[PDB]
Structures are given as C-alpha cells and as structure tokens.
Write an enzyme that holds these catalytic residues in place. Structure first.
Site, short mmCIF file in Angstrom:
data_model
loop_
_atom_site.label_atom_id
_atom_site.label_comp_id
_atom_site.label_asym_id
_atom_site.label_seq_id
_atom_site.Cartn_x
_atom_site.Cartn_y
_atom_site.Cartn_z
N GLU A 158 94.44 -35.34 93.42
CA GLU A 158 94.86 -34.46 92.32
C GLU A 158 95.42 -33.18 92.95
N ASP A 201 89.75 -25.60 92.55
CA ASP A 201 88.35 -25.40 92.24
C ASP A 201 87.90 -24.05 92.75
OD1 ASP A 201 88.42 -28.10 91.34
OD2 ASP A 201 86.49 -28.56 92.27
N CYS A 209 79.23 -28.09 89.00
CA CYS A 209 78.71 -29.12 89.89
C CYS A 209 78.20 -28.49 91.20
CB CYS A 209 79.86 -30.04 90.22
SG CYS A 209 80.57 -30.88 88.74
N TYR A 265 79.98 -37.24 83.68
CA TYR A 265 78.99 -37.27 84.76
C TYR A 265 77.65 -37.78 84.27
CZ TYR A 265 82.20 -34.41 87.60
OH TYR A 265 83.29 -33.93 88.31
N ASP A 314 68.22 -29.61 85.56
CA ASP A 314 67.78 -28.23 85.48
C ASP A 314 66.56 -28.09 86.38
OD1 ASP A 314 69.51 -27.22 83.50
OD2 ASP A 314 68.16 -27.83 81.91
N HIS A 346 71.84 -28.94 83.06
CA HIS A 346 73.09 -28.21 82.84
C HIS A 346 73.93 -27.99 84.11
CE1 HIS A 346 70.48 -27.21 79.40
NE2 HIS A 346 71.61 -27.20 78.71
N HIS A 399 87.35 -31.80 96.96
CA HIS A 399 86.67 -30.56 96.68
C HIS A 399 85.16 -30.62 96.94
CE1 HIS A 399 90.19 -29.84 93.87
NE2 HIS A 399 90.18 -28.76 94.63
N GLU A 418 86.26 -26.96 88.32
CA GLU A 418 87.69 -27.02 88.18
C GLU A 418 88.10 -25.83 87.33
OE1 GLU A 418 89.45 -30.48 86.23
OE2 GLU A 418 87.91 -31.62 87.39
#
Length: 186
Positions: A27, A31, A56, A72, A77, A113, A130, A151
C-alpha cells in the site's frame, strides 16, 4: 520530490518518546508510529485524533510467544488499573504493559481497545510493513521491541504528510530508506 527525514532522526525521535510518520510504497500510505513503552495520555490522544480507526501495537515474535499469540480479531485492554479501556490514558497503560518484558496473557482482558500485531522476525528486511518498521525503530532506539501505530486518515498525499509532519515536529521516512539504513549499519 518531497523532503524525507533521515532514519537517524526518526530513531532519535522514537528514543525521545516522540512519534514519526512512516510511508511504504505494498500500500502507499502513512502510519504514525511511536514506541509502545513511551505511550502517554498525550501521545495516544494525538494518535486517536488522526487514526482512521484502530490503534495497533506491533510486537516482536518473542513477545507474542510469551503472551500467547502464535504463527482485527484480537483486541486487548490491561486487566488492572484502568477505567473501561477506551480513554487515551487507558490505552497508553495497555500499550506500556504490552512492551513490559514480564507481561503475560493474564495481565490483559479481551476484547479491548488496542490491537496487538506480530512483526516478522528480521523486521523490514524480511517483510517491508509498517508493523515491522515500528518494531525496528523501537529496537534501533534502544527500547523494548514494541511499537504503536495507526494509519493516518487519508505526489499530493506525500505532500500533505510532509506539512502535517512539520506542523507537529515529526520525522517522515520511507520503509525503503529504513531497509537501506538497516542493510548498511547492521
């Protein structure tokens, strides 16, 4: 031809607890990247402001093995010492725990999260992603091999990234320049 920062400057930013922007040309997008152990409320808030969606945490294979994600769907958490998990400060805490060399699956709850990701051994020399770049930069900065990436909400594109980078004092580099730097200095 937009100015790119040196890999050395990106590594220095990472080491100082700052973010950088990394472009690939898989791509072709940018990021935002910092070291996971350097996560703060302020930096996560900053990343939340400009993420297309997920935050991420690229992790080295050894870390993923220890936590129990092999090879994903998966979100986590921190189990203790947070609110509901979505605040900038909760996410920062989760990020730091993932970079802690003694964290185990028990220290986390699912779903959550923050998205852990497994970087390929060899980093960008093996897979020019990335995910691998974020782990490489943290490791090159002398830190735990754990990054935090998103991103950025979307040549004219590389141009706007350069302005955005400058407005916030961030380095802008390519994965190509990272691959090249690593080949030479490793």
């Amino acid at each position: 031809m937009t100015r790119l920062d040196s890999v050395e400057r990106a590594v220095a930013d990472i080491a100082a607890g700052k973010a950088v922007i990394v472009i690939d040309d898989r791509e072709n997008e940018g990021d935002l990247i910092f070291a996971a152990e350097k996560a703060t409320p302020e930096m996560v808030a900053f990343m939340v402001r400009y993420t297309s969606g997920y935050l991420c945490v690229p992790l080295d294979g050894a870390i993923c093995d220890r936590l129990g994600l092999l090879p994903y769907t998966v979100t986590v958490d921190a189990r203790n010492g947070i609110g509901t998990g979505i605040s900038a400060s909760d996410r920062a805490t989760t990020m730091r725990l993932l970079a802690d060399p003694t964290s185990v699956a028990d220290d986390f709850t699912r779903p959550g999260h923050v998205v852990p990701l497994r970087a390929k051994d060899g980093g960008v020399l093996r897979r020019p992603g990335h995910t691998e770049a974020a782990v490489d930069l943290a490791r090159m900065a002398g830190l735990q091999p754990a990054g935090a990436i998103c991103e950025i909400v979307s040549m004219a594109h590389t141009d706007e990234l350069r302005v955005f980078a400058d407005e916030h004092g961030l380095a802008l580099i390519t994965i190509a320049d990272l691959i090249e730097w690593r080949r030479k200095h490793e």
